[PDB]
Design a protein around this nucleic acid. Structure first.
Ligand SMILES: C[As](C)(=O)[O-]
Ligand SMILES: C[As](C)(=O)[O-]
Ligand SMILES: C[As](C)(=O)[O-]
Ligand SMILES: [K+]
Ligand SMILES: [Mg+2]
Ligand SMILES: [Mg+2]
Lengths: 402, 401
DNA sequence: ATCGTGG
DNA sequence: CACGAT
DNA sequence: ATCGTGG
DNA sequence: CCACGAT
């Protein structure tokens, strides 16, 4: 069956959180982050809290024993007033001391405060936020376990990758599309993935109106491929897949036309192979159902329309995923072989999730853009610091949205 | 798993034609028809041909050895020309000699001629048509074997029934609804089935306009239950299910209202138990797909909407949508009954007396479609009007196979 | 904002 | 807004 | 119209 | 609509 590759050449089965954590303890993550200061800051508001003391102690021991990040110092900073300027002051003090990342405890679920601060941190340094009011002894082990998966990832580590056949699937997968943040405004995104689930590069457009969609969809995709290719100049792309997703303008024929043009221009510029084999797929979550056997089940609805019956992580809930081939340059002879590889690849990618230990059972090429969209929409709604990925190698190559 | 009951208390697995045929050889069908003349007529226009001769000897040996119908004689009648008048002449000659059924060989595909003759035969005597031109290419063995399943059924035999649990399922299933034969015209149907898949009674309305749909739906259903109850005075109808299907007017709210009323009125008249538990279901064939077993699998789409993955390298699925549009049930028994009605529908999908190969579509949906095909084409090519109401053999035999 | 999922 | 996850 | 299916 | 397949 499918397995995750972790450190020292080890692999562990999927769908088993306990064996994955024990694997990390024994062998380390697939890639330990390389840190510059060996220092992280814990910023909080309860200098004498027993729960804060337990949290810091668990963070310290699991970073060392689970993630094999050794000899990290955790420095503490306390803010007085639970308001933006007071907290930002401590964030700035921490940044001025030399830290690799900031772990920031906020009092409660104050949404405008959260997004103003989170937008500031994303623009400054890797960060992991936490809620003081939600901490609890009962949940602290699970809380810290999962929190560190995404924090290590935000520091540039690679917790685990998918073990996949190097001879099958795509050389890169581009998750692309757009997300409306209200009835008029939207932003485009383009993320490059390796078939083992790792994100290589990501770009987002500025917020624009729907009438600007096709223009920025092409330029955003070209920017992400230029960035991938500049930093991976020998990565040959002979087989390419686009996974298109998001709530976006109804324009299907014209979107597909522009996506083909974009690939054709990338071929002309030698960004992918001049004889790249590619397909453009629409991925859509469809209405769940319950069976009254489907792990990795592929359903053919027509030559171009498929359903992947993804299990939800009496009745067995199913969270189906619709997969439409809207364009491809495949031969009739290789078509159904290629169909099986791209559907398998989608199923494998649905096992990749660096938000925490449990799989989301949704392809990372769809899921990570939804995370980005949540942040971009709310930062705009609550007037935070705009997030500018281009020209920021840290934002382009790290999963800051987890 | 599921089995078919055949003769002499024997049962054979479903999904296995070879064992079904052998089982019939050893034990006979569930019910051998009782014939009045022990005579079948073969009517054709190929006298002294040898393809006719081996057809007749395959028919002769198989009705005897597979169907256990002993001592049958087959008489031949030759018509001089492949036209209605000439053939009708020999049909009439055969009927006057006293025969239990007619096997009629036509020379080629001739749709007006076929529906003229079939509608005449349906109004006269059990019949089976055959085409001489495609008989020459086919493997006669498979041809006659399947031919005889439906001919024996049209003569009133029961090849096999479903083995089902007498304490589970509906006491009767009424498959009802209507089918359009063009953009404006339709007819209603209502067929009463036992849970073992056997048809007890059928009625059809005359062809009417869509605007007449609801009035003839209630009347067609009342007629089928009256007819069934007069022939089964002692049958206690305490659990009733309706399977509504067919390409019909889009009047779901009004149709449901009408059906609920009909069931109510039937309770007043003691056609069904004062305490009858009933449910009204819409059955709809949905678009086929392929899995790249589902045998008996049930999918819930919502609390009232279900999907059966009927089976019919890829696995072709012919799904059936099942929506519960009304029911009598308490919330305590509700999900117990849902599983009962969905199993029952799966079971009914194994009943097909058109040949040996199951059609994997419930008989409450399939047989109305067979009827619709005949009614639509008799009206389009001007055959003899078909109505069972004044004809017990049409009301109680699968003339439409 | 540890997450997710079923209300 | 509840609660369970290894 | 053996009947089904699939291209 | 033509053509294989089925026990
Ligand atoms: C091989 As095809 C059904 O896409 O022409
Ligand atoms: C958070 As601001 C003042 O850059 O919109
Ligand atoms: C009822 As007629 C076939 O004689 O028109
Ligand atoms: K008949
Ligand atoms: Mg997060
Ligand atoms: Mg027939």
């Amino acid at each position: 069956g499918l397995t995750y590759r972790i450190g020292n050449g080890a692999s562990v089965p999927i769908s088993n959180t306990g064996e994955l954590i024990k694997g990390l303890r024994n062998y380390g993550p697939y890639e330990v982050p390389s840190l510059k200061y060996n220092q992280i800051a814990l910023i909080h508001n309860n200098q004498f809290s027993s729960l804060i003391n337990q949290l810091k102690s668990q963070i310290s021991s699991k970073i060392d024993e689970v993630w094999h990040i050794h000899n990290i110092n955790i420095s503490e900073f306390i803010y007085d007033s639970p308001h933006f300027d007071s907290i930002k002051s401590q964030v700035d003090n921490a940044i001025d001391t030399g830290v690799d990342g900031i772990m920031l405890v906020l009092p409660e679920y104050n949404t405008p405060l959260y997004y103003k601060l989170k937008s500031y941190l994303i623009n400054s340094i890797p960060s992991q936020f936490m809620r003081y009011d939600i901490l609890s002894n009962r949940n602290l082990t699970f809380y810290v376990d999962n929190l560190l998966v995404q924090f290590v990832s935000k520091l540039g580590g690679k917790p685990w990758i998918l073990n996949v056949d190097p001879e099958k699937g795509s050389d890169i997968i581009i998750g692309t599309g757009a997300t409306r943040i209200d009835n008029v405004n939207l932003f485009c995104f383009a993320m490059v993935f390796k078939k083992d689930g790792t994100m290589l590069w990501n770009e987002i457009s500025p917020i624009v109106t729907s009438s600007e969609y096709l223009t920025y969809l092409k330029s955003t995709i070209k920017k992400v491929v230029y960035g991938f290719k500049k930093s991976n100049p020998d990565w040959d792309v002979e087989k390419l897949t686009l996974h298109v997703s998001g709530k976006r303008p109804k324009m299907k024929d014209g979107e597909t036309k522009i996506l083909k043009e974009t690939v054709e221009e990338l071929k002309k510029q030698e960004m992918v192979s001049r004889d790249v084999k590619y397909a453009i797929l629409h991925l859509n979550e469809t209405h769940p159902f319950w069976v009254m056997p489907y792990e990795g089940t592929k359903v053919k609805l027509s030559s171009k329309r498929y359903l992947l019956t993804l299990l939800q992580p009496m009745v067995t809930p199913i969270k189906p995923l619709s997969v439409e081939i809207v364009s491809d340059n495949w031969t009739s002879e290789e078509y159904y072989h290629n169909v099986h590889e791209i559907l398998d690849e989608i199923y494998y990618l649905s096992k990749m999730n660096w938000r925490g230990f449990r799989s989301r059972n949704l392809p990372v090429t769809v899921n990570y853009p939804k995370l980005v969209a949540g942040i971009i929409a709310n930062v705009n709604r609550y007037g935070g610091y705009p997030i500018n990925p281009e020209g920021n190698r840290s934002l382009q190559t790290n999963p800051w949205f987890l």
